[PDB]
Amino acid sequence: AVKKFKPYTPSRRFMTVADFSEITKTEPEKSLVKPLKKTGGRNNQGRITVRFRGGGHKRLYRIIDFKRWDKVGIPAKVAAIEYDPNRSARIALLHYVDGEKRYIIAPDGLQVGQQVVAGPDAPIQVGNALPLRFIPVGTVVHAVELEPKKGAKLARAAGTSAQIQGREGDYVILRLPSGELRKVHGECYATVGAVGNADHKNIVLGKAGRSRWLGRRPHVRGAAMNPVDHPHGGGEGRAPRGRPPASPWGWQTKGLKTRKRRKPSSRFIIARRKK
Amino acid sequence: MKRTWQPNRRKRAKTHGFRARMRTPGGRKVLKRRRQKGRWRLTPAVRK
RNA sequence: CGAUGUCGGCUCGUCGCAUCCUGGGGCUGAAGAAGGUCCCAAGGGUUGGGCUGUUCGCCCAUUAAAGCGGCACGCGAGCUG
RNA sequence: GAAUGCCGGCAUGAGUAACGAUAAAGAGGGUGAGAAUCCCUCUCGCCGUAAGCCCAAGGGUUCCUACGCAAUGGUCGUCAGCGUAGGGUUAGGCGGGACCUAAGGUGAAGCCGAAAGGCGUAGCCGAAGGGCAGCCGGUUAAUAUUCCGGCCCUUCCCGCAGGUGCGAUGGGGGGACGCUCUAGGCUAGGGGGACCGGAGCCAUGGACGAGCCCGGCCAGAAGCGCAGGGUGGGAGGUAGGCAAAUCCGCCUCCCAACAAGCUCUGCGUGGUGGGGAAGCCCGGGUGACAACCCCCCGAAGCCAGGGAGCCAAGAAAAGCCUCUAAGCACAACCUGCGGGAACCCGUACCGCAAACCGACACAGGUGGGCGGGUGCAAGAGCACUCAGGCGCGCGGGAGAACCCUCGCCAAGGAACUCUGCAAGUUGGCCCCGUAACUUCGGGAGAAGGGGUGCUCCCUGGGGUGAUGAGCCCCGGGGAGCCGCAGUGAACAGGCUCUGGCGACUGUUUACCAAAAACACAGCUCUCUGCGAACUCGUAAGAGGAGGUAUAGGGAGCGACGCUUGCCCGGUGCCGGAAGGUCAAGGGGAGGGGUGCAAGCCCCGAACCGAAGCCCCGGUGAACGGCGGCCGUAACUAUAACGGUCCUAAGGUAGCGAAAUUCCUUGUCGGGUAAGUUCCGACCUGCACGAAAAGCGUAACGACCGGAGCGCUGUCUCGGCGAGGGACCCGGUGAAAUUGAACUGGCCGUGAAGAUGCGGCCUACCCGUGGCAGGACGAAAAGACCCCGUGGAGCUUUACUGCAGCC
RNA sequence: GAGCUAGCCCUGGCCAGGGUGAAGCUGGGGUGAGACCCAGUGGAGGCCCGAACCGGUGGGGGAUGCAAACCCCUCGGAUGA
RNA sequence: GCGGGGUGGAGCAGCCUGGUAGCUCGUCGGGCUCAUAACCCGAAGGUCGUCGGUUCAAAUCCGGCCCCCGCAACCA
RNA sequence: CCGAGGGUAGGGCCCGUGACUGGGGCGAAGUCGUAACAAGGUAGCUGUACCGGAAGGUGCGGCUGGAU
RNA sequence: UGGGAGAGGGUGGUGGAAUUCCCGGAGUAGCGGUGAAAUGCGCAGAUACCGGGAGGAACGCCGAUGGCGAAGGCAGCCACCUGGUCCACCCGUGACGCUGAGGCGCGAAAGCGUGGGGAGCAAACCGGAUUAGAUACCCGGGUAGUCCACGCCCUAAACG
Ligand SMILES: CC(=O)c1cccc(N[C@H]2[C@H](N)[C@@](NC(=O)N(C)C)([C@H](C)O)[C@@](C)(O)[C@@]2(O)COC(=O)c2c(C)cccc2O)c1
Ligand SMILES: [K+]
Ligand SMILES: [Mg+2]
Ligand SMILES: [Mg+2]
Ligand SMILES: [Mg+2]
Ligand SMILES: [Mg+2]
Ligand SMILES: [Mg+2]
Ligand SMILES: [Mg+2]
Ligand SMILES: [Mg+2]
Ligand SMILES: [Mg+2]
Ligand SMILES: [Mg+2]
Ligand SMILES: [Mg+2]
Ligand SMILES: [Mg+2]
Ligand SMILES: [Mg+2]
Ligand SMILES: [Mg+2]
Ligand SMILES: [Mg+2]
Ligand SMILES: [Mg+2]
Ligand SMILES: [Mg+2]
Ligand SMILES: [Mg+2]
Ligand SMILES: [Mg+2]
Ligand SMILES: [Mg+2]
Ligand SMILES: [Mg+2]
Ligand SMILES: [Mg+2]
Ligand SMILES: [Mg+2]
Ligand SMILES: [Mg+2]
Ligand SMILES: [Mg+2]
Ligand SMILES: [Mg+2]
Ligand SMILES: [Mg+2]
Ligand SMILES: [Mg+2]
Ligand SMILES: [Mg+2]
Ligand SMILES: [Mg+2]
Ligand SMILES: [Mg+2]
Ligand SMILES: [Mg+2]
Ligand SMILES: [Mg+2]
Ligand SMILES: [Mg+2]
Ligand SMILES: [Mg+2]
Ligand SMILES: [Mg+2]
Ligand SMILES: [Mg+2]
Ligand SMILES: [Mg+2]
Ligand SMILES: [Mg+2]
Ligand SMILES: [Mg+2]
Ligand SMILES: [Mg+2]
Ligand SMILES: [Mg+2]
Ligand SMILES: [Mg+2]
Ligand SMILES: [Mg+2]
Ligand SMILES: [Mg+2]
Ligand SMILES: [Mg+2]
Ligand SMILES: [Mg+2]
Ligand SMILES: [Mg+2]
Ligand SMILES: [Mg+2]
Ligand SMILES: [Mg+2]
Ligand SMILES: [Mg+2]
Ligand SMILES: [Mg+2]
Ligand SMILES: [Mg+2]
Ligand SMILES: [Mg+2]
Ligand SMILES: [Mg+2]
Ligand SMILES: [Mg+2]
Ligand SMILES: [Mg+2]
Ligand SMILES: [Mg+2]
Ligand SMILES: [Mg+2]
Ligand SMILES: [Mg+2]
Ligand SMILES: [Mg+2]
Ligand SMILES: [Mg+2]
Ligand SMILES: [Mg+2]
Ligand SMILES: [Mg+2]
Ligand SMILES: [Mg+2]
Ligand SMILES: [Mg+2]
Ligand SMILES: [Mg+2]
Ligand SMILES: [Mg+2]
Ligand SMILES: [Mg+2]
Ligand SMILES: [Mg+2]
Ligand SMILES: [Mg+2]
Ligand SMILES: [Mg+2]
Ligand SMILES: [Mg+2]
Ligand SMILES: [Mg+2]
Ligand SMILES: [Mg+2]
Ligand SMILES: [Mg+2]
Ligand SMILES: [Mg+2]
Ligand SMILES: [Mg+2]
Ligand SMILES: [Mg+2]
Ligand SMILES: [Mg+2]
Ligand SMILES: [Mg+2]
Ligand SMILES: [Mg+2]
Ligand SMILES: [Mg+2]
Ligand SMILES: [Mg+2]
Ligand SMILES: [Mg+2]
Ligand SMILES: [Mg+2]
Ligand SMILES: [Mg+2]
Ligand SMILES: [Mg+2]
Ligand SMILES: [Mg+2]
Ligand SMILES: [Mg+2]
Ligand SMILES: [Mg+2]
Ligand SMILES: [Mg+2]
Ligand SMILES: [Mg+2]
Ligand SMILES: [Mg+2]
Ligand SMILES: [Mg+2]
Ligand SMILES: [Mg+2]
Ligand SMILES: [Mg+2]
Ligand SMILES: [Mg+2]
Ligand SMILES: [Mg+2]
Ligand SMILES: [Mg+2]
Ligand SMILES: [Mg+2]
Ligand SMILES: [Mg+2]
Ligand SMILES: [Mg+2]
Ligand SMILES: [Mg+2]
Ligand SMILES: [Mg+2]
Ligand SMILES: [Mg+2]
Ligand SMILES: [Mg+2]
Ligand SMILES: [Mg+2]
Ligand SMILES: [Mg+2]
Ligand SMILES: [Mg+2]
Ligand SMILES: [Mg+2]
Ligand SMILES: [Mg+2]
Ligand SMILES: [Mg+2]
Ligand SMILES: [Mg+2]
Ligand SMILES: [Mg+2]
Ligand SMILES: [Mg+2]
Ligand SMILES: [Mg+2]
Ligand SMILES: [Mg+2]
Ligand SMILES: [Mg+2]
Ligand SMILES: [Mg+2]
Ligand SMILES: [Mg+2]
Ligand SMILES: [Mg+2]
Ligand SMILES: [Mg+2]
Ligand SMILES: [Mg+2]
Ligand SMILES: [Mg+2]
Ligand SMILES: [Mg+2]
Ligand SMILES: [Mg+2]
Ligand SMILES: [Mg+2]
Ligand SMILES: [Mg+2]
Ligand SMILES: [Mg+2]
Ligand SMILES: [Mg+2]
Ligand SMILES: [Mg+2]
Ligand SMILES: [Mg+2]
Ligand SMILES: [Mg+2]
Ligand SMILES: [Mg+2]
Ligand SMILES: [Mg+2]
Ligand SMILES: [Mg+2]
Ligand SMILES: [Mg+2]
Ligand SMILES: [Mg+2]
Ligand SMILES: [Mg+2]
Ligand SMILES: [Mg+2]
Ligand SMILES: [Mg+2]
Ligand SMILES: [Mg+2]
Ligand SMILES: [Mg+2]
Ligand SMILES: [Mg+2]
Ligand SMILES: [Mg+2]
Ligand SMILES: [Mg+2]
Ligand SMILES: [Mg+2]
Ligand SMILES: [Mg+2]
Ligand SMILES: [Mg+2]
Ligand SMILES: [Mg+2]
Ligand SMILES: [Mg+2]
Ligand SMILES: [Mg+2]
Ligand SMILES: [Mg+2]
Ligand SMILES: [Mg+2]
Ligand SMILES: [Mg+2]
Ligand SMILES: [Mg+2]
Ligand SMILES: [Mg+2]
Ligand SMILES: [Mg+2]
Ligand SMILES: [Mg+2]
Ligand SMILES: [Mg+2]
Ligand SMILES: [Mg+2]
Ligand SMILES: [Mg+2]
Ligand SMILES: [Mg+2]
Ligand SMILES: [Mg+2]
Ligand SMILES: [Mg+2]
Ligand SMILES: [Mg+2]
Ligand SMILES: [Mg+2]
Ligand SMILES: [Mg+2]
Ligand SMILES: [Mg+2]
Ligand SMILES: [Mg+2]
Ligand SMILES: [Mg+2]
Ligand SMILES: [Mg+2]
Ligand SMILES: [Mg+2]
Ligand SMILES: [Mg+2]
Ligand SMILES: [Mg+2]
Ligand SMILES: [Mg+2]
Ligand SMILES: [Mg+2]
Ligand SMILES: [Mg+2]
Ligand SMILES: [Mg+2]
Ligand SMILES: [Mg+2]
Ligand SMILES: [Mg+2]
Ligand SMILES: [Mg+2]
Ligand SMILES: [Mg+2]
Ligand SMILES: [Mg+2]
Ligand SMILES: [Mg+2]
Ligand SMILES: [Mg+2]
Ligand SMILES: [Mg+2]
Ligand SMILES: [Mg+2]
Ligand SMILES: [Mg+2]
Ligand SMILES: [Mg+2]
Ligand SMILES: [Mg+2]
Ligand SMILES: [Mg+2]
Ligand SMILES: [Mg+2]
Ligand SMILES: [Mg+2]
Ligand SMILES: [Mg+2]
Ligand SMILES: [Mg+2]
Ligand SMILES: [Mg+2]
Ligand SMILES: [Mg+2]
Ligand SMILES: [Mg+2]
Ligand SMILES: [Mg+2]
Ligand SMILES: [Mg+2]
Ligand SMILES: [Mg+2]
Ligand SMILES: [Mg+2]
Ligand SMILES: [Mg+2]
Ligand SMILES: [Mg+2]
Ligand SMILES: [Mg+2]
Ligand SMILES: [Mg+2]
Ligand SMILES: [Mg+2]
Ligand SMILES: [Mg+2]
Ligand SMILES: [Mg+2]
Ligand SMILES: [Mg+2]
Ligand SMILES: [Mg+2]
Ligand SMILES: [Mg+2]
Ligand SMILES: [Mg+2]
Ligand SMILES: [Mg+2]
Ligand SMILES: [Mg+2]
Ligand SMILES: [Mg+2]
Ligand SMILES: [Mg+2]
Ligand SMILES: [Mg+2]
């Protein structure tokens, strides 16, 4: 769930925090962490290329296993479930019988102590990884490779899942988190189950400070600026858009589709997204 | 109040210094010009 | 226009008289008292407050009366702003 | 001779302003040609969470001594951070380097760019982070963890002895980490002592005292003690830790586990070495064979890699340890001991300031550590004061106006004014007590009130110790004393009611705006399937993100409550293999030029032919928009009702003379003696209205209204008083400005506001303190206005291009 | 040219003292079990008062300044965006 | 100051493009109904705000006057 | 010491009054429509919701006190 | 003790029919809709037909004047968890009982909060008709909602 606070400051009034109930281990594998080089949204030129970023809490990156076909047939025990500050999902520590230790993102209901495994012959059960071609049509599924051996790309965020809808040739038909209908190749691995921590989205930041802790610096409206700065800039007193609503760089921002028409993957997308 | 000149020996040397000047096309033309003009100093005096 | 600072207030006055009051008068539809109207008169006087940046005005309480104008809509090398 | 010309010189203002914090001076004695200003002494005052001390920047000889005083020093100067000269800075252990890595920078490989160059894994560089061995005292005019003394320690090389599969830039462990709170035990520091040491002291009424005054420690290897940190042991399997591995990791088994053992720090002890006051003599001697002891308080520091809780989830790499590979096992490595070796740079001095940044010996700015005592609830607050350091580099008088900063004030008490602006008032702690409203937390320090010192007596509990004495902390009760007054000085809210706006803490126009503006959690729309969209870049490459639709970009709105109506005709965006239009290209009906002809050459119709546009639909928390006239009810008035024109549709709920209302001080009601403002109502809303959101809303606000209480020099209405200036004398001595001046008033005249012309009036010559009416006074070639076929920023369905995208 | 200033990145440092008293925990009450109530413990927070530090609200002074933005009094934040 | 408007009783065409006044309602007569409305059948009523001009001819084109609505009135 | 009561400050209950506002009762012959009683010409009634000059309409579920 | 019937309740799963939408196929001049029509959909290839897919909601026949529950209410099928209730036997307890102000729980639909879901239906709303008007009845669209989970609301011609 998500936990409330009593209104003993103006901000604690609406603030909510995750319950961290599923967490069993509160410091990470030293051998599995490296430092996360904070960018501040600046690129190698030194220029801001993603506005309003910086000054969030320090973080160590936990190395995650997004392959799984790395260790076919070798089973693992789920040692712990831990906090990961780099993603919405929680992560599970896996102790392979190999001795080797790895992190995966923790599917919903995955239990510390249980066993998981990967490969064509794996039982259809939460935490297991199989090529999509071997996973029974209708099962919810996450951490999906988009192309074989290229890494898990789809449905990694908290609470998200893709569902296998059917098969066709060497491809299987998925319903993505977004609601898009897409053909993904059958050799692509995927873990069965949805991602855990589904109550993530119900968190109420509650105050400006919380945004600042996440490296989220204040976003300043176009309408609040001057013509030198923004299409919506200027005007005596408040002003409506006075033109079709636009980005800082001039392009329209209510409806204007932006995916390339002649993109090769178009041949593999059956139906554009949901709502 | 806090004025604009805030001396710092490392800053000085790393910004206007001989080796900074030589690393860049424009930095070199400065040395060429100050040499052509006959400057007794090609580079700001900093005690290292 | 190689600059004559621009409203009102405050302070400080000074002048005009087409006189608000006080003084002197004629006429009166002036009985008395109190008024009206006009003439002579600038010596002195011409209050305190509510509202508004306000000038002005309206209102309150008084007064002999609560005059109107000029002085770069007097006065920012005097103040305010 | 003029260019607000240029360069230089020299005037005027003028012996004028000023001489840079209002912490403050006085005298005696030296010195010297000369002394308020230098030196010494005594007295006085100021700082003391500093105005004292130690670091780091930065500065660069300013340090010490002798000799000097032209200039520099806001005066003086014999003095000096000044002039001349001489001297002064000593390290294996402090800091940096011969060690490590962070951002970042650089960059074999590689990638990209007309050139210049841009990028880029490893690697390398990069520190105030990691790592690493010295403490106390003494000495110089001037350095000292550096020299000296005492006691310790590190690495490197060689040798001897003992032990071992030795061996790494490779594997592994460790280094290795947040915020808030915090236990035990210590140290730093401090308080007291009737105890130990000490020159002396008895005054002026008393005291020869359990009197006063002074001091009562520092460092220290091995060992021991106290407190703590770190760490299980054995064996079997083993496919994982890009080779190997006995290591590490995973499984199983026996053992023991708020322990223990082993190890590592801190503190105490510790052989030994040092230090050692007031006072009185001349920095030194003495004191002094100095004493060096007990009690209490006690850190934010130490044990430290301690513990707990929390979410926002908290560097790396080496040193070190372990593992093995080449190899090598006469070698090598570990332990112990001995001898030898141990480099480069810094080190002076200033360092909250006269030596740094501010043109100045400039009331400004400048990171880290120490920062004593007493009282006040606490404290780094505040008053005083220790150590220490100062009196601010012009003075001496006078006792005007006026100015500044300050104190008091009869009666009144906001009558001041745009405004209670300003200044009063209130003011700490303890207890009693506290309303509407509320999101139940708040509103709350609401409001309002009582207490507050000193003395004696009785008594409760805690800390340390021992369970007691003493010392220390927190109380309770009774009786009294004094004054005008007991937080007796200093530091320390005035309060309430009611609106507007913004929910809130935050943010902003450095240097005229702090706000109702920006931001904000939150709400919605929209793009984005990952080599994502989007952003920077010619590109490579980056960011996005080592993220993946519970995510990321864009936009509007802005907590929360209740809500968010109608219009898709126009613009936008979205969907639509039809149709229409459409460029290059395809096609070549049919021409034309030339040639004797083959031929060569040029124009070229129909048709096929993309996006875009047209066309057909959708779409409002997309751009946007949301009517007119006329009539009508059995008193009037008004019009639920009707008629008709028009629209894409005619403004819904809610609100309304408003941060919006022109007429306007609308009208009525409230408040007031009186109310263009305020509040509550009404509604012909010139010209509200629903995310450029609508109406509300507890709390919040250095926001802007209105009112009341309290209290006042704001005022009626001013008076007195203080200090710093102004004034006078000695010293030093600017400035803008300035055509030249022998520079009066009126009434006129004049380019229309005259010291300067006319007429008249008035007027001996020259200053000093003052006031500002004039010299259309100074300043700034008006910043408004216009003019210039002058510029710049910004906009768009102006023109014309370009990037980008199709 | 970012030794001023604006943002970010890396690595360090700082924030006296006082006040309020959330979650949780413990116990008690409660019930079929609960919710929940009470007490103690606890020590949260862009919480409160207030130095350092960071600011710059109102007023006064200064205005050829001590100063090309300062001085005095008053005032905002002060565990956090 | 600039723009649009005035035509049967009401609200709107016709004006631009001179000749030819129309639409809905209302009114009047007649039907249906026991009766009223609704509904069905017929009918009347405008010489076009006013004056002046152009023209063979004016609601229509051009001017003056009356009105009636809108929009504007900025820089100090 | 207590003490009538006076004063200051703040609460609580009640009564009267108030621009304006909300609906309510009533009133010989006002305007608009015709919702209900006959399947009242769409069976009615209903709780709730939203909308509309007005009666009312409609959705969802319920009742017969409706069907003939 | 031994047995019974039952849509009593809660959870998990799961089956076919129909509608809508999408895809492929085949096919062409209309379909839809009504009192009649119009709006609407359709040569950009609709309706009608076949095949594939997706998704939500509701369970035809059995089904009844039936059954169950205290009431509201409960209907495909399967499994699990659970309540009520009846019969027989006449074994056990020995009046342990009836009612019940307060309290507590449950409580159709609509409505509300947070999230999901959304095929059909459908307040509001739009359009077409009808009408003097028609903010209705009829027709074509259509948003809440209707569905799930949790938490509220606590009404009813909650009636026998
Ligand atoms: C023939 C026929 O049924 C018809 C004819 C003309 C008009 C109408 N109108 C009908 C109209 N379409 C109407 N009913 C309807 O469509 N049905 C399918 C029943 C409405 C939309 O609900 C009605 C109730 O107005 C109507 O049913 C009654 O009106 C009359 O019955 C009606 C009227 C009003 C006037 C004259 C005759 C009538 O029947 C129907
Ligand atoms: K102007
Ligand atoms: Mg909360
Ligand atoms: Mg969790
Ligand atoms: Mg690591
Ligand atoms: Mg770079
Ligand atoms: Mg670069
Ligand atoms: Mg960006
Ligand atoms: Mg950024
Ligand atoms: Mg996580
Ligand atoms: Mg963060
Ligand atoms: Mg914003
Ligand atoms: Mg703006
Ligand atoms: Mg702006
Ligand atoms: Mg710019
Ligand atoms: Mg622009
Ligand atoms: Mg704009
Ligand atoms: Mg604007
Ligand atoms: Mg505007
Ligand atoms: Mg605009
Ligand atoms: Mg616009
Ligand atoms: Mg635009
Ligand atoms: Mg684009
Ligand atoms: Mg899609
Ligand atoms: Mg600096
Ligand atoms: Mg440096
Ligand atoms: Mg530097
Ligand atoms: Mg350099
Ligand atoms: Mg030379
Ligand atoms: Mg140079
Ligand atoms: Mg002028
Ligand atoms: Mg001039
Ligand atoms: Mg001028
Ligand atoms: Mg001038
Ligand atoms: Mg008489
Ligand atoms: Mg007179
Ligand atoms: Mg006035
Ligand atoms: Mg007036
Ligand atoms: Mg009189
Ligand atoms: Mg005038
Ligand atoms: Mg004037
Ligand atoms: Mg004036
Ligand atoms: Mg002035
Ligand atoms: Mg003035
Ligand atoms: Mg002047
Ligand atoms: Mg003047
Ligand atoms: Mg000349
Ligand atoms: Mg000059
Ligand atoms: Mg002179
Ligand atoms: Mg003189
Ligand atoms: Mg002078
Ligand atoms: Mg002077
Ligand atoms: Mg001075
Ligand atoms: Mg002297
Ligand atoms: Mg002298
Ligand atoms: Mg001296
Ligand atoms: Mg002190
Ligand atoms: Mg002090
Ligand atoms: Mg210097
Ligand atoms: Mg000299
Ligand atoms: Mg001399
Ligand atoms: Mg001299
Ligand atoms: Mg000098
Ligand atoms: Mg001198
Ligand atoms: Mg000086
Ligand atoms: Mg001499
Ligand atoms: Mg020296
Ligand atoms: Mg040494
Ligand atoms: Mg060497
Ligand atoms: Mg190095
Ligand atoms: Mg290195
Ligand atoms: Mg190369
Ligand atoms: Mg290095
Ligand atoms: Mg470097
Ligand atoms: Mg270092
Ligand atoms: Mg570190
Ligand atoms: Mg060192
Ligand atoms: Mg040592
Ligand atoms: Mg010597
Ligand atoms: Mg070995
Ligand atoms: Mg190693
Ligand atoms: Mg770590
Ligand atoms: Mg010690
Ligand atoms: Mg003490
Ligand atoms: Mg003695
Ligand atoms: Mg192995
Ligand atoms: Mg290996
Ligand atoms: Mg001594
Ligand atoms: Mg001796
Ligand atoms: Mg710890
Ligand atoms: Mg935290
Ligand atoms: Mg070998
Ligand atoms: Mg050998
Ligand atoms: Mg060994
Ligand atoms: Mg060397
Ligand atoms: Mg030294
Ligand atoms: Mg000095
Ligand atoms: Mg000085
Ligand atoms: Mg200074
Ligand atoms: Mg201290
Ligand atoms: Mg105190
Ligand atoms: Mg002095
Ligand atoms: Mg001085
Ligand atoms: Mg004098
Ligand atoms: Mg007085
Ligand atoms: Mg008063
Ligand atoms: Mg009073
Ligand atoms: Mg007042
Ligand atoms: Mg006021
Ligand atoms: Mg006071
Ligand atoms: Mg006080
Ligand atoms: Mg009250
Ligand atoms: Mg409350
Ligand atoms: Mg009080
Ligand atoms: Mg006393
Ligand atoms: Mg206070
Ligand atoms: Mg107002
Ligand atoms: Mg605000
Ligand atoms: Mg604001
Ligand atoms: Mg608001
Ligand atoms: Mg807000
Ligand atoms: Mg704050
Ligand atoms: Mg400013
Ligand atoms: Mg400015
Ligand atoms: Mg500026
Ligand atoms: Mg300003
Ligand atoms: Mg200011
Ligand atoms: Mg400001
Ligand atoms: Mg503020
Ligand atoms: Mg702003
Ligand atoms: Mg919101
Ligand atoms: Mg570019
Ligand atoms: Mg680009
Ligand atoms: Mg990355
Ligand atoms: Mg992302
Ligand atoms: Mg975003
Ligand atoms: Mg905002
Ligand atoms: Mg539209
Ligand atoms: Mg449309
Ligand atoms: Mg449109
Ligand atoms: Mg062609
Ligand atoms: Mg509406
Ligand atoms: Mg109004
Ligand atoms: Mg008003
Ligand atoms: Mg009014
Ligand atoms: Mg308005
Ligand atoms: Mg008005
Ligand atoms: Mg008014
Ligand atoms: Mg007005
Ligand atoms: Mg009035
Ligand atoms: Mg009244
Ligand atoms: Mg005002
Ligand atoms: Mg009002
Ligand atoms: Mg009105
Ligand atoms: Mg508005
Ligand atoms: Mg808007
Ligand atoms: Mg409002
Ligand atoms: Mg409020
Ligand atoms: Mg509320
Ligand atoms: Mg505020
Ligand atoms: Mg404020
Ligand atoms: Mg005064
Ligand atoms: Mg004085
Ligand atoms: Mg001069
Ligand atoms: Mg002359
Ligand atoms: Mg004249
Ligand atoms: Mg004249
Ligand atoms: Mg003359
Ligand atoms: Mg003449
Ligand atoms: Mg003359
Ligand atoms: Mg004359
Ligand atoms: Mg005269
Ligand atoms: Mg003057
Ligand atoms: Mg003058
Ligand atoms: Mg000037
Ligand atoms: Mg000019
Ligand atoms: Mg100018
Ligand atoms: Mg031109
Ligand atoms: Mg021209
Ligand atoms: Mg020009
Ligand atoms: Mg131009
Ligand atoms: Mg331009
Ligand atoms: Mg800097
Ligand atoms: Mg400190
Ligand atoms: Mg407590
Ligand atoms: Mg219990
Ligand atoms: Mg706070
Ligand atoms: Mg200030
Ligand atoms: Mg500042
Ligand atoms: Mg003040
Ligand atoms: Mg200034
Ligand atoms: Mg100051
Ligand atoms: Mg102050
Ligand atoms: Mg304050
Ligand atoms: Mg504070
Ligand atoms: Mg604090
Ligand atoms: Mg922070
Ligand atoms: Mg005109
Ligand atoms: Mg026409
Ligand atoms: Mg024409
Ligand atoms: Mg015609
Ligand atoms: Mg009859
Ligand atoms: Mg005619
Ligand atoms: Mg005609
Ligand atoms: Mg203008
Ligand atoms: Mg009495
Ligand atoms: Mg009816
Ligand atoms: Mg009905
Ligand atoms: Mg009917
Ligand atoms: Mg009916
Ligand atoms: Mg109506
Ligand atoms: Mg309806
Ligand atoms: Mg066709
Ligand atoms: Mg029996
Ligand atoms: Mg219910
Ligand atoms: Mg329901
Ligand atoms: Mg409801
Ligand atoms: Mg509902
Ligand atoms: Mg009809
Ligand atoms: Mg009608
Ligand atoms: Mg729907």
XYZ file of C-alpha atoms (C1' of nucleotides) in Angstrom, chain D residues 308-341:
34
model
C 18.367 3.035 16.828
C 14.887 5.006 13.506
C 13.780 6.892 8.682
C 13.528 7.365 2.956
C 15.011 10.907 -0.583
C 18.468 4.940 -0.262
C 23.671 7.757 0.790
C 32.075 8.249 -4.488
C 36.217 5.966 -6.479
C 41.102 4.037 -6.490
C 45.560 2.804 -3.953
C 47.839 1.400 0.656
C 46.546 -3.431 3.331
C 44.949 -8.940 3.526
C 43.976 -13.389 0.936
C 44.199 -16.363 -3.823
C 46.806 -18.492 -7.246
C 49.710 -17.773 -13.280
C 53.608 -17.187 -15.785
C 57.961 -18.035 -13.314
C 61.025 -19.498 -9.457
C 61.682 -22.805 -5.730
C 71.073 -21.564 -4.518
C 65.598 -17.650 -5.790
C 61.376 -15.391 -3.330
C 58.276 -13.867 0.552
C 56.579 -13.381 6.108
C 58.293 -12.566 11.229
C 62.419 -11.018 14.656
C 66.989 -8.462 15.297
C 71.287 -5.359 13.554
C 73.961 -1.823 10.504
C 73.435 1.421 6.771
C 70.304 4.967 3.609
